[PDB]
Enzyme design. Structure first.
Site, PDB file in Angstrom:
ATOM      1  N   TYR A   1      -4.279  -9.582   5.153  1.00 21.52           N
ATOM      2  CA  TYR A   1      -4.780  -8.809   4.624  1.00 21.52           C
ATOM      3  C   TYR A   1      -5.744  -8.168   5.374  1.00 21.52           C
ATOM      4  O   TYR A   1      -6.349  -7.296   6.295  1.00 21.52           O
ATOM      5  CB  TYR A   1      -4.275  -7.819   3.738  1.00 21.52           C
ATOM      6  CG  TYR A   1      -2.747  -7.334   3.004  1.00 21.52           C
ATOM      7  CD1 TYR A   1      -1.947  -8.561   2.389  1.00 21.52           C
ATOM      8  CD2 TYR A   1      -2.456  -6.043   3.710  1.00 21.52           C
ATOM      9  CE1 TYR A   1      -0.359  -7.912   1.978  1.00 21.52           C
ATOM     10  CE2 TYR A   1      -1.446  -5.293   3.483  1.00 21.52           C
ATOM     11  CZ  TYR A   1      -0.302  -6.620   1.950  1.00 21.52           C
ATOM     12  OH  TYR A   1       0.635  -5.874   2.028  1.00 21.52           O
TER      13      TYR A   1
ATOM     14  N   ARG B   1       8.622  -3.234  -7.640  1.00 23.50           N
ATOM     15  CA  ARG B   1       8.444  -1.297  -7.589  1.00 23.50           C
ATOM     16  C   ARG B   1       8.748  -0.898  -8.262  1.00 23.50           C
ATOM     17  O   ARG B   1       9.124   0.325  -8.210  1.00 23.50           O
ATOM     18  CB  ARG B   1       8.228  -0.975  -6.297  1.00 23.50           C
ATOM     19  CG  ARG B   1       7.246  -1.472  -5.611  1.00 23.50           C
ATOM     20  CD  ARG B   1       7.297  -0.791  -4.051  1.00 23.50           C
ATOM     21  NE  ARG B   1       6.356  -2.029  -3.106  1.00 23.50           N
ATOM     22  CZ  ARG B   1       6.111  -1.315  -1.821  1.00 23.50           C
ATOM     23  NH1 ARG B   1       6.953  -0.627  -1.054  1.00 23.50           N
ATOM     24  NH2 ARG B   1       5.724  -2.259  -0.890  1.00 23.50           N
TER      25      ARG B   1
ATOM     26  N   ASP C   1      -2.210  -3.571  -7.509  1.00 22.99           N
ATOM     27  CA  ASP C   1      -2.057  -4.098  -6.174  1.00 22.99           C
ATOM     28  C   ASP C   1      -2.840  -5.043  -5.566  1.00 22.99           C
ATOM     29  O   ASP C   1      -3.135  -5.729  -7.056  1.00 22.99           O
ATOM     30  CB  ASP C   1      -3.577  -3.273  -5.801  1.00 22.99           C
ATOM     31  CG  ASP C   1      -2.724  -3.094  -4.449  1.00 22.99           C
ATOM     32  OD1 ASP C   1      -2.559  -3.353  -3.866  1.00 22.99           O
ATOM     33  OD2 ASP C   1      -3.502  -2.488  -3.971  1.00 22.99           O
TER      34      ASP C   1
ATOM     35  N   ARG D   1      -0.296   8.914 -10.575  1.00 22.60           N
ATOM     36  CA  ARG D   1      -1.339   8.594  -9.448  1.00 22.60           C
ATOM     37  C   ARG D   1      -2.517  10.146  -9.159  1.00 22.60           C
ATOM     38  O   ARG D   1      -3.087   9.660  -8.061  1.00 22.60           O
ATOM     39  CB  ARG D   1      -0.735   7.796  -8.683  1.00 22.60           C
ATOM     40  CG  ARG D   1      -1.028   6.562  -8.095  1.00 22.60           C
ATOM     41  CD  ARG D   1      -2.006   6.381  -7.656  1.00 22.60           C
ATOM     42  NE  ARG D   1      -3.190   5.299  -8.381  1.00 22.60           N
ATOM     43  CZ  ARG D   1      -2.893   4.476  -7.116  1.00 22.60           C
ATOM     44  NH1 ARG D   1      -0.988   3.552  -6.768  1.00 22.60           N
ATOM     45  NH2 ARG D   1      -3.116   3.011  -7.857  1.00 22.60           N
TER      46      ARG D   1
ATOM     47  N   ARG E   1       6.671   4.386  -6.657  1.00 20.92           N
ATOM     48  CA  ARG E   1       6.845   6.781  -6.230  1.00 20.92           C
ATOM     49  C   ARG E   1       8.121   7.046  -5.658  1.00 20.92           C
ATOM     50  O   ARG E   1       8.499   8.460  -5.804  1.00 20.92           O
ATOM     51  CB  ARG E   1       6.434   6.786  -4.604  1.00 20.92           C
ATOM     52  CG  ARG E   1       3.953   6.041  -4.060  1.00 20.92           C
ATOM     53  CD  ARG E   1       4.468   6.589  -2.705  1.00 20.92           C
ATOM     54  NE  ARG E   1       3.764   8.089  -2.841  1.00 20.92           N
ATOM     55  CZ  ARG E   1       2.938   8.997  -3.687  1.00 20.92           C
ATOM     56  NH1 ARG E   1       2.449   8.116  -4.076  1.00 20.92           N
ATOM     57  NH2 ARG E   1       2.973   9.882  -3.521  1.00 20.92           N
TER      58      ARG E   1
END
Lengths: 357, 357
Positions: free
Chosen positions: A155, A28, A77, A41, A32
């Site tokens: 998921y 990562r 992703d 983004r 963010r």
């Protein structure tokens, strides 16, 4: 036809060779926690600023402008695969990743695309990889990635995150056949996807089994491990048959302490570790052949730069200078200080050299 | 002045003695998976049907009416301690356990009660224990419990559940002093609470460190382990000084594979295990002195009764007939079949006898 690699430390360490220092990167790293990441983004929704090669390339490059990381990982992703398989995602700011219509009955598998056509649906990822590989201009290697079959299954069945994976595990116990069917579909889609990432320019691959911990040894060896082994085997074979050189592959099983021994024999050059496994014990479990990756508690970065330096020093001592790639035990968190990430990177380089000299 | 214990198998196994069969109980045996549990709990809110001795006694007894469990555990909540400390809870049906005003700054510790006065605030729990001990009429032993200091701290700082414990762990790294202060407050409140549970009739005690896994070895030994050790030491001492016989104490650290060795030397007779740790490896880590508890994947109960029987058979073989108390790796889930729980209980009894005869 890409630029020649200048800094290949991460690759040499990945293959088990000795290096002048310990290479380091952060899961990562494009995240963010970087202000510039949020701005870029915010161009459009998730699957729009992700479907744009230039956008992904920019996000991938951002951390490298702040820190001398020894590898870059394509921004994307893990959910792109289930999506390419035919499942609709509704990425909201609050919840985040979500499938409003999850798989719950065996019949639900009928709406999925033939895994053979998934790679063609993921062309935008390949374009972003080629573009990033070109723009990096051989500064450091580019890592490609995907989620492991079991993790992708969670998921798809859960519809999103979960602290128990009760619905997905219920599938394993009540619908073993349908579970294997879904896991095989996922494997047959991941192989050509990963092969395509290398064809597009990826110089290494990491398979994320982020939800390994919910399974115990028995379920893991029954439903996760076989497919993890299959992915590496088939990707290597297809790459050779295409005339390309296989790339080093990494298997990261978060909370997978119980599977370290099997994972070291799964056909991967590197085994990534979460922060709960002591480095020395991990070394015992894996052996002396494979390369180990990471491990610092991502939350350790909340500590002062000086404290981070000491924690890094201790981590490197436990791992030793051989067969090791530094990283965190999991991805960076949104509220972490970019300056503390820089301290982590600098500490690894500084101490790894002192550990040698 | 309570009824004499008729079936003490669980206690003898807890102390390491040989038994005719393996005793078994389930975390959350009094839980939503039982229809009768939902009806009784629907009397009023959480902290009302929990503050009623007769209500807790009834909930505690319900599972024993369905299954020949070898122990009963008082129905309560781990959050009763932070509440008695002065924190307000807003138990809603959707979210569940929650503190609308969590501890975030060091100054927030000032609103907490002196830990010395917590036991007096928890009198209703003691009353429920005495009442249940009387009504059980010596059928099986009654287990008392509380959450461990670190786990209680996570709820107080996070305000509820979390997949990362980022705020609580940030406290450990940025506010080590305040963290130790809070952990000590929690310890000083837990000791008299646990001692009071024994005085009220508890025949064994279990300390739940449900959020152990978020910490790695280093943080655990620094912030969780010291207090876990202190609780057992001080509870034993206070019980002896009061003329009472200490009771067997259990330490359950969910996702605490990395701390099994330290936990076996923490002063507890029993070490509870989650389902991710292989029984034989756990035995290696803990040694040959302590008793091990549990371990079946709670989700295994979704499998058929026949499959559950086989999974139980395999689990018992790995653990062996000595120093072992059967249980699940974590609490029962709300959507599990009561009949499958019965099968788990029956299988343990059946196979443990066959493993001996």
């Amino acid at each position: 036809g890409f630029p020649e690699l200048k800094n290949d430390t991460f690759l040499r360490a990945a293959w088990g060779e000795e290096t002048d220092y310990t290479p380091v990167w952060c899961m990562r790293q494009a995240g963010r926690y970087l202000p510039e990441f949020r701005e870029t983004r915010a161009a459009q929704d998730f699957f729009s600023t992700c479907r744009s090669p230039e956008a992904c390339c920019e996000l991938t490059l951002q951390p490298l402008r702040r820190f001398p990381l020894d590898a870059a990982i394509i921004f994307s992703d893990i959910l792109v695969v289930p999506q390419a398989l035919g499942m609709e995602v509704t990425m909201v700011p609050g919840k985040g990743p979500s499938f409003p219509e999850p798989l719950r009955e065996e019949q639900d598998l009928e709406r999925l695309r033939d895994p053979e056509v998934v790679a063609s649906e993921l062309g935008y990822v390949f374009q972003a990889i080629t573009l990033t590989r070109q723009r990096l201009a051989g500064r450091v290697p580019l890592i490609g990635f995907a989620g492991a079959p079991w993790t992708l299954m969670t998921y798809m069945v859960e519809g999103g995150g979960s602290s128990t994976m009760a619905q997905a595990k219920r599938w394993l116990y009540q619908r073993p056949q349908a579970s294997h069917q879904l896991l095989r579909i996922l494997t047959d889609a991941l192989v050509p996807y990963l092969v395509g990432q290398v064809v597009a320019g990826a110089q290494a691959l990491q398979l994320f089994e982020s939800h390994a911990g919910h399974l115990g040894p028995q379920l893991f060896n029954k439903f996760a491990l076989p497919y993890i082994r299959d992915v590496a085997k088939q990707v290597k074979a297809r790459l050779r048959e295409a005339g390309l050189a296989p790339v080093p592959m990494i298997t990261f099983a978060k909370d997978g302490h119980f599977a370290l021994e099997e994972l070291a024999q799964a056909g991967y050059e590197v085994v990534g570790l979460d922060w709960t496994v002591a480095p020395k014990k991990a070394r015992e479990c894996v052996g002396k052949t494979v390369t180990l990756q990471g491990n610092l508690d991502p939350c350790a970065l909340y500590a002062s730069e000086e404290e981070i330096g000491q924690l890094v020093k201790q981590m490197l001592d436990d791992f030793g200078p051989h067969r090791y790639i530094a990283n965190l035990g999991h991805g960076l968190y949104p509220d972490m200080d970019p300056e503390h990430v820089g301290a982590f990177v600098d500490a690894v380089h500084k101490h790894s050299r002192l550990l040698r000299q």
